[PDB]
Design a protein around this ligand. Structure first.
Ligand SMILES: Nc1nc2c(ncn2[C@@H]2O[C@H](COP(=O)(O)OP(=O)(O)OP(=O)(O)O)[C@@H](O)[C@H]2O)c(=O)[nH]1
Ligand SMILES: Nc1nc2c(ncn2[C@@H]2O[C@H](COP(=O)(O)OP(=O)(O)OP(=O)(O)O)[C@@H](O)[C@H]2O)c(=O)[nH]1
Ligand SMILES: Nc1nc2c(ncn2[C@@H]2O[C@H](COP(=O)(O)OP(=O)(O)O)[C@@H](O)[C@H]2O)c(=O)[nH]1
Ligand SMILES: [Mg+2]
Ligand SMILES: [Mg+2]
Lengths: 136, 49, 430, 431, 431
């Protein structure tokens, strides 16, 4: 909470006068002094409170942490190595890592539980088609 | 304009608080793995003894 | 004032929009967090045309991104300037169409359209005064070509007096990527001609060819393609957002270009466009700009415009120039090329001037031409369509999802009638 | 959000799946124990909630030897302990045994496993199935699974990677019979079939890899590379993606014709891979080269219907389109008349990965084609000839008759193959 | 200030009491000697003023062996020495022994102990009683104790956890007689009864724990886990707490129908526990899986009356109620028409524990459900058939006659079971 949102009605009632009587700006100067006023109002709120090429990500595993596991079955001799076990004896080395990795992230769409239908009641109001000065 | 921009300044702080709440939810998520790893290693060695 | 709302669907359309929004944000000096860092006051006078103001003070595009597969929008969000789009406006499916017009127009899209039409209704009503709608899509794909055109019909049924602009990518028979392209192309164009107020054709083949020839760039890509088409799109409505000597909006272009209600298919071009090594060699003047815009090699369509006669043409200039010079340039170009200009309508060139140039360039021009030369794309597409259709190839799906060959025959007949009527005026004499 | 379920049945299926899952884990960085040391593995894996990952595969067999080898080998920890289903008695090359006697008591548990696995996934794309056709249990269980699944799930896509016996080299002597029977069974139930005869791949291995000592390890590694290249679009970002639903969009003119044949490029050893620049045009010409076709069939003997090729690497759309232009220019390769354009090409950024201790050299650009052409009638003709040579005198028939199969059942298969041949010959004619 | 008094009678009661009292002391961190290492316990234990705690349990038996084993075991220092009441002779599976001859001289001491225990407690909710129905002493003493308490205390609630004979697995031959007699006695006296036959638990242990040669210890551990899951709501904080008096106010449509059957999930060993999510939806589906009942009855053969389930762990009401909606959507589970809603849910934060040397692995989410369903008539039917086959020729009746029990008594129990079966059949029809 902040103090500014504590200001209340009945306090806007008569409360001094912002400018001293002796320092009135004159006509021509005010008439030439519109632009800074306008840009102040319009993007005061933008500067204060409002404030290529594909890239590859790194591969998940680092080589020094491969820690390949031994087989549960304890083979005694090289003679009895079977023809099904060649898959995966050799740990990858510096040569076999892919240099670049381009994954797909789905975290944005792993959300939005369901599409929305406005289960509401108009409230559109009319703006008129030509020179809104006659629309109610 | 000063008071209105103070209001949006408050709204930004509200975002910051809710983001920290999301990070707290992630810290909560850590708990399951933190239990699981050691818990199941010991529970698997239990039958081995 | 007189603002328009953007809608894009299909991955081709999403890639188009991602570059279009980046280009317009760069033009107005909007950072990808929505905060202003431009220099000129004129940069922000008409920002409400495309942007809506949010609390805190950022600007958000009034764009409706729609798709039947979420990977495309997940990709575009991670891209640069992806944060601008409001999360609410995204609408997506979980199945996709698989390049099947029947699936994307009858089965899945019919159920999914409710939310997207609701958000279109809300966003369109929210703005002050509607000027029109604009859509970008590719005709070679099932989901795009079907759902986009069905949504066009639905929006037309609800806003009959508004204008609708479409940027359609057509499947050229030269660079062909899918075997079922002619089918959904014809099926889409049948519905498009009846509803869309303006349709402007873009060909991947022609874009690639101009990239190879006038850019002379070694390895062109979809990024450069989207950049070219984005500059072309922005040039159309630049004079809408900025004051100029001859302000001209989309409704004025529509009234000026189409002699008859069903002839609203245009081909466009952009200039100046030079190789990077010769950019300082060339001499940017009005005569060079006009000879470049009227060069047949600069058109972004495969059609050869010299094989037919121009019905109407129009040019939009960016930068400050003397209007008279442009005037006699158009006059002399029309005078010597009376053979290529249809005669029963005198002075068939429109020109508009806007005093703001593109960032980094001193003059620019965008060309639109309604000519009878486009009939060749339609003829070749219909030829491929009938070649595939005589042997009843691939028809079993479209039969299996509530659709049948009767409306295929009707679509072929309608397309042939359109071609014949478009050609009838080519030989017309006074 | 996209998921696909893999089925391996038969000894050939298991020995191919082991190699393919080796390559998948190597590609996604998952260590053999299943524990890693944004979400791309979701195509083939499932997160356990905390730690390791579970493959989305099922292994089936009736002889326990290979299943036990899997459950004891280095990849033991990876699979769920209760998804490697093993029977007790082998069908022993008898399709009748594997389709009427023993498989009926294992198919139930298989379907419970399949249902429980499909329940976890939310965006199920389809099924892959692997089975050697020249085996009793393979053919029978595969046929039964396809017939059951096609009615349980309906419109879901299924892709069968069948290894048809070579024209003249085969292991057994009874494989034509069960090949014909299983072909009849799958013709009305599989949406896509891929030809994978062994002899052509053996030819490729002896010629290009320069290996005079080839075994099934190299065969399975090649098939795994083909699978990975085919599925890269589901789990890797690219300038032009394709879904498994976007295959029968371009490869299936009519529901009866759904058998296609594959090819891969480039194939070269590391000792001479670095003596060439390996252009995209060169590799795509090697792709359409008839002798590099993965199936022992001659494309020069018939028309093409349609081809779809996947490129992975740093290829350029102009490179692809320029190559396709030259291919269309070529006179020797002729397409069917009613297909003006028949090419479907896709692009993916991820270069192919190399397996340590393998034979294939690491190359930055690769292309994998699936083609549907009229030439496929020749293998069916020779299979029918071999089937007739044996059935002319009722050889081996009593072994199938004594396992519950009726006498006449061969007649319907023979007639269906005749109808298939006539359908190809009549769709191959010009109008 | 919430207490409940626990009664153990019979060998089955003692053998489950040992297991459950090990579990409770593991829950509350109390060493077997009774000391606490340096308020939730107040439900089950009472403070001695300085040091240890005394469980609120009483053990009754006419068999000195198990009592002596308890008094010589590791828990010798926990229980009060003068609440382990032991007799001199066993009933020898004869109901008349434990109901008319030998239990009358011990029931007075039992009631004196009960009075002394109840005087200390101030906010007692009721009694939990454990007994075996197939034992003479268990049945007779349970019947006599319930008859005495029902007039001594009045409206206090009593819960009987009875282990009924299996359809065909059994250890005795005369047990239908004592079973029918005990049903006659406690039908009028027990507010809530739980069916816990052994064969279903055997099947659970075989299928899930993958234990091929288990014993009664595993059964008793499972029963203790169920009891703790039931009673955690009284001694731990929960988002939706349920009391003992909050069970009968939902689970008993009519005064006669008060037998329920339970299920518990998950039941998974650590060898494969960490291979799956253990998600709320899958555990609540496992709860209603017909094979996971600890009672050998088929829920599919009858309508449901009322289901009350307690979740413990990090469960979320969103998840729970979303699962309940799916269950209601499911077709193969049907409820009686006059019960539009039948679910009583409870949520607690305390996760279940693991006991050292056990088989189960603890998990972050557990569910225990109690169901009253119309299918329970089948067990009464089969027990009635077993009774009739033996009583047709007056087999074994003379040893019940010769111990003071009059002959005609069996007819009354038979006609009351007939009345109960008729009541179930009547209430099972739709309106
Ligand atoms: N490509 C390839 N084919 C194989 C491999 N192993 C077996 N086959 C083929 O499988 C056919 C016979 O079936 P098998 O795989 O040996 O065994 P099965 O399919 O389980 O049938 P059964 O032998 O009855 O158990 C042979 O003709 C081989 O061509 C392999 O490792 N690679
Ligand atoms: N679940 C389980 N049931 C048991 C156990 N011990 C005995 N029972 C059951 O008890 C029934 C018979 O009663 P018992 O407990 O053996 O003996 P009893 O109830 O004290 O009656 P008596 O034999 O006269 O002493 C058998 O049918 C068993 O099913 C046990 O440790 N676990
Ligand atoms: N300009 C441009 N066109 C593209 C891009 N990506 C794809 N295309 C075009 O889109 C066509 C394929 O569209 P398709 O995938 O079927 O659209 P869908 O139906 O929405 O899936 C191809 O012919 C390409 O020419 C891109 O990044 N830029
Ligand atoms: Mg085999
Ligand atoms: Mg006993």
């Amino acid at each position: 909470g902040c103090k500014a949102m504590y200001q209340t009605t009945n306090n806007d009632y008569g409360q001094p006068f912002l400018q001293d009587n002796k320092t009135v700006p004159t006509y021509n100067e005010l008439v030439e002094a519109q632009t800074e006023v306008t840009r102040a109002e319009k993007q005061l709120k933008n500067k204060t409170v409002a404030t290529n090429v594909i890239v590859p990500k790194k591969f998940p595993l680092k080589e020094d942490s491969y820690k390949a596991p031994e087989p549960g079955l304890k083979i005694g001799n090289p003679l009895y190595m079977t023809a099904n076990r060649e898959y995966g004896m050799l740990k990858p080395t510096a040569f076999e890592i892919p240099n670049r990795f381009y994954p797909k992230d789905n975290t944005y769409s792993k959300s939005f539980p369901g599409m929305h239908k406005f289960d509401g009641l108009n409230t559109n109001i009319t703006f008129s088609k030509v020179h809104r000065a006659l629309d109610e | 304009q000063t008071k209105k921009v103070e209001a949006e300044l408050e709204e930004n702080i509200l975002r910051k608080c809710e983001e920290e709440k999301r990070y707290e939810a992630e810290k909560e998520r850590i708990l399951n793995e933190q239990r699981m790893q050691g818990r199941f290693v010991l529970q698997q060695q239990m039958l081995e003894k | 004032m007189r603002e328009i709302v953007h809608i894009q669907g299909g991955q081709c359309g999403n890639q188009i929009g991602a570059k279009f929004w980046e280009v317009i944000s760069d033009e107005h000096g909007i950072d990808p967090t929505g905060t202003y860092h431009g220099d000129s006051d004129l940069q922000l006078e008409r920002i409400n045309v495309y942007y809506n103001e949010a609390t805190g003070g950022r600007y958000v595009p009034r764009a409706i991104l729609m798709d039947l597969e979420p990977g495309t929008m997940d990709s575009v969000r991670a891209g640069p300037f992806g944060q601008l789009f409001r999360p609410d406006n995204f609408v997506f499916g979980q199945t996709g169409a698989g390049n099947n017009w029947a699936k994307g127009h009858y089965t899945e899209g019919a159920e999914l359209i409710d939310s997207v039409l609701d958000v279109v209704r809300k966003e369109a009503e929210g703005c002050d005064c509607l000027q029109g709608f604009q859509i970008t899509h590719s005709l070679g794909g099932g989901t795009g070509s079907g759902m986009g055109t069905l949504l066009i019909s639905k929006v037309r049924e609800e806003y009959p007096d508004r204008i609708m602009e479409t940027f359609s990518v057509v499947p050229s028979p030269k660079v062909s990527d899918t075997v079922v392209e002619p089918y959904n192309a014809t099926l889409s164009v049948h519905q498009l001609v009846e509803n869309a107020d303006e349709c402007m054709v873009i060909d991947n083949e022609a874009l690639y060819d101009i990239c190879f020839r006038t850019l002379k760039l070694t390895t062109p890509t979809y990024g450069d393609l989207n950049h070219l088409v984005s500059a072309a799109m922005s040039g159309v409505t630049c004079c809408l957002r900025f004051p100029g000597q001859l302000n001209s909006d989309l409704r004025k272009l529509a009234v000026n270009l189409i002699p008859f209600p069903r002839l609203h298919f245009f081909m466009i071009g952009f200039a100046p466009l030079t190789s990077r090594g010769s950019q300082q060699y060339r001499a940017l003047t009005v005569p060079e700009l006009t000879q470049q815009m009227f060069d047949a090699k600069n058109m972004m369509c495969a059609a050869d415009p010299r094989h037919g006669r121009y019905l109407t043409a129009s040019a939009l200039f960016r930068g400050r120039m003397s209007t008279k010079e442009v005037d006699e340039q158009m006059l002399n170009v029309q005078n010597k090329n009376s053979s290529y200009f249809v005669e029963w309508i005198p002075n068939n060139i429109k020109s508009s001037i806007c005093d703001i140039p593109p960032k980094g360039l001193k003059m620019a021009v965008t060309f639109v031409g309604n000519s009878t030369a486009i009939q060749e794309m339609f003829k070749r597409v219909a030829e491929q369509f009938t070649a595939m259709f005589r042997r009843k190839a691939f028809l079993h799906w479209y039969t299996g999802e509530g659709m049948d060959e009767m409306e295929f025959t009707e679509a072929e007949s309608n397309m042939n009638d359109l071609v014949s009527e478009y050609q009838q005026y080519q030989d017309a004499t006074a | 959000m996209r998921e696909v379920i893999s089925i391996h049945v038969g000894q050939g299926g298991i020995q191919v799946g082991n190699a393919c899952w080796e390559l998948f884990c190597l590609e996604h960085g998952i260590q053999p124990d299943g524990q890693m040391p944004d979400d791309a593995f979701n195509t083939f894996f499932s997160e356990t909630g905390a730690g390791k990952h579970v493959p989305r595969a099922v292994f089936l067999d009736l002889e326990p030897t290979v299943i036990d080898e899997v459950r004891t080998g280095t990849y033991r920890q990876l699979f769920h302990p209760e998804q490697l289903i093993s029977g007790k008695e082998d069908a022993a090359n008898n399709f009748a045994r594997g389709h009427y006697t023993i498989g009926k008591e294992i198919v139930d548990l298989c379907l419970d496993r399949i249902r429980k696995l499909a329940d976890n996934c939310t965006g199920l794309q389809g099924f892959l199935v692997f089975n050697s056709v020249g085996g009793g249990t393979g053919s029978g269980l595969g046929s039964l699974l396809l017939e059951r699944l096609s009615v349980d799930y309906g419109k879901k896509s299924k892709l069968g990677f069948t290894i048809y016996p070579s024209p003249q080299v085969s292991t057994a002597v009874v494989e034509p019979y069960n090949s014909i029977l299983s072909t009849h069974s799958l013709l009305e139930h599989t949406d896509v079939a891929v030809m994978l005869d062994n002899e052509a791949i053996y030819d490729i291995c002896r010629r290009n890899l320069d290996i005079e000592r080839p075994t099934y390890t190299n065969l399975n590694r090649l098939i795994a590379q083909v699978i990975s290249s085919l599925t890269a679009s589901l789990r890797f970002d690219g300038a032009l993606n394709v879904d498994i639903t976007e295959f029968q969009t371009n490869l299936v003119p009519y529901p009866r014709i759904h058998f296609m044949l594959s090819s891969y490029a480039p194939i070269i050893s590391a000792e001479k891979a670095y003596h060439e620049q390996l252009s995209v045009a060169e590799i795509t010409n090697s792709a359409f080269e008839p002798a590099n076709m993965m199936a022992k069939c001659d494309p020069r003997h018939g028309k093409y219907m349609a081809c779809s090729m996947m490129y992975r690497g740093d290829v350029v759309p102009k490179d692809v389109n320029a190559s396709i232009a030259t291919i269309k220019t070529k006179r020797t390769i002729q397409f069917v008349d009613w297909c003006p354009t028949g090419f479907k090409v896709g692009i993916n950024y991820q270069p192919p990965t190399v397996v340590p201790g393998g034979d294939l050299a690491k190359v930055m650009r690769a292309v994998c084609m699936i083609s549907n052409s009229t030439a496929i009638a020749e293998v069916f003709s020779r299979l029918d000839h071999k089937f007739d040579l044996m059935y002319a005198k009722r050889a081996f028939v009593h072994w199938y008759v004594g396992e519950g199969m009726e006498e006449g059942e061969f007649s319907e298969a023979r007639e269906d193959l005749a109808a298939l041949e006539k359908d190809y010959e009549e769709v191959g004619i010009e109008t």
